[PDB]
Design a protein around this ligand. Structure first.
Ligand SMILES: CCCCCCCCCCCCCCCC(=O)O[C@H](CCCCCCCCCCC)CC(=O)N[C@H]1[C@@H](OP(=O)(O)O)O[C@H](CO[C@@H]2O[C@H](CO)[C@@H](OP(=O)(O)O)[C@H](OC(=O)C[C@@H](CCCCCCCCCCC)OC(=O)CCCCCCCCCCCCC)[C@H]2NC(=O)C[C@@H](CCCCCCCCCCC)OC(=O)CCCCCCCCCCC)[C@@H](O)[C@@H]1OC(=O)C[C@H](O)CCCCCCCCCCC
Ligand SMILES: O=C(O)[C@H]1C[C@@H](O)[C@@H](O)[C@@H]([C@H](O)CO)O1
Lengths: 58, 58
């Protein structure tokens, strides 16, 4: 060890960060009167309805 | 006039010449709104700033 033959110095680093996300929301707060389309074998009713409103410009 | 006239009824108009009182009290209000948005942002980076002797080729 007379010289710096044994003198040693070293550093090392490794950092990793990963992220991920997702969202999906929906809301509906109306009331619509529909009409029966047909009666199924079990008695369930197929209902279809439509409502058109022309407030102004569309 | 020789026509018959009830005593206890509310004297509603009944013939062509009869007059009636109308209170307008009309009030209509309609509103409509709609909105939409879509934002996408991406930004990628990669850099050595120091390359090993064995990796200098790539
Ligand atoms: C979904 C997955 C599907 C599979 C995909 C398959 C891989 C899909 C393909 C991914 C790889 C990209 C191809 C890049 C080269 C290429 O073809 O497309 C180029 C255009 C880009 C199109 C790409 C769009 C893809 C579209 C996207 C498609 C994605 C799907 C054209 C071109 O060629 N341009 C070219 C041109 O530029 P110019 O035009 O200006 O002239 O010339 C200049 C100067 O040339 C240099 O000069 C130097 C001296 O000056 C000299 O060094 P010297 O020693 O001599 O001194 C040096 O030689 C040297 O490297 C010396 C030596 C280095 C050894 C060190 C150890 C490294 C080990 C590293 C190990 C790698 C570990 C994976 O070599 C090599 O052995 C390279 C290692 C081979 C590994 C084989 C994999 C085994 C499987 C090992 C598997 C491991 C299992 C765990 C000279 N280098 C060259 O010639 C170039 C080439 C020589 C080829 C001969 C070697 C045998 C190839 C043999 C076969 C290769 C076939 C592919 O090497 C390469 O990189 C090749 C990389 C291949 C990696 C594929 C992995 C497959 C996984 C397999 C998966 C299935 C170049 O800079 C420039 O290239 C460059 O810049 C490139 C840059 O560097 C490197 C950046 C990489 C970042 C990632 C990409 C990021 C891009 C992302 C954005 C799109
Ligand atoms: O005993 C040796 O082998 C040495 C001692 C140091 O001086 C070392 O650095 C080397 C030098 O290179 C000679 O010129 O010689």
């Amino acid at each position: 060890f007379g010289n710096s033959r044994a003198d040693m110095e070293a550093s090392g680093g490794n950092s990793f960060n990963g992220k991920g996300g997702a969202n999906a929301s929906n809301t509906f707060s109306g009331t619509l009167t529909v009409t029966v389309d047909q009666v199924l074998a079990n008695g369930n009713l197929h209902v279809v309805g439509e409502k058109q409103i022309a407030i102004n410009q569309g | 006039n020789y026509g018959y006239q009830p005593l206890f009824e509310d004297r509603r108009p009944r013939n062509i010449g009869d007059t009636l009182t109308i209170v307008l009290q009309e009030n209509v209000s309609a509103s409509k709104s709609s909105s939409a948005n879509a934002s996408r942002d991406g930004k990628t980076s990669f850099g050595f700033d120091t390359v090993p002797r064995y990796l200098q080729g790539l």
